[PDB]
């Protein structure tokens, strides 16, 4: 009897300039498709573009 | 006189096509950039908002 | 890079096949430990004995012997759908 479950970093840690647990980036985040590395690096050579 | 209805937009003059976003329908949406892997064509639509 | 590839979508070929009529045996656990294949064999009292699962070394057909180097190319010279920026 037991919930396996997903637990994100922000949901445990707050440090200020560590962590961003804005509920602004967590609402954003939270709209976000499941992402893979390669999926991250994609964004970030856009954003660059 | 006459005004039927009077929004409150995000400006297209400050977040240019320069800036990637398309705001024609009233939110912006970046293409190419957050993107769901494994998913049919046109799924990615909603990523970019 | 394509832990995605393998976890996110050839799992799912695996889950399949698994399925497939044909795949009859099974053939782990899980457990490196404790696993062992069930063994059969055809037999009779007059003195057949023919073992489903036995070692006859290298055989013509090229299943036998396993190269593990194969682990490169698919780390390291392999494409996926998944990676990459879509395709169906």
Redesign the interface.
Known sequence: RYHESVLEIADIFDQADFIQTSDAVRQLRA?????????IR??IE??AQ | YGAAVVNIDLNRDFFDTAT?IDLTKGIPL?Q??????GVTAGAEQS?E? | ?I??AHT?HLSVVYATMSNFMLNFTNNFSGNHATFKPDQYVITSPEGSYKPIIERQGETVDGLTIIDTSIVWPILCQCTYP????MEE
């Open positions: 709209l976000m498709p499941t992402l893979s590395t390669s999926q994609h964004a856009r954003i | 990637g970046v190419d950039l957050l993107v769901p892997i990523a908002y | 890079n832990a995605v996110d998944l990676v990459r920026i």
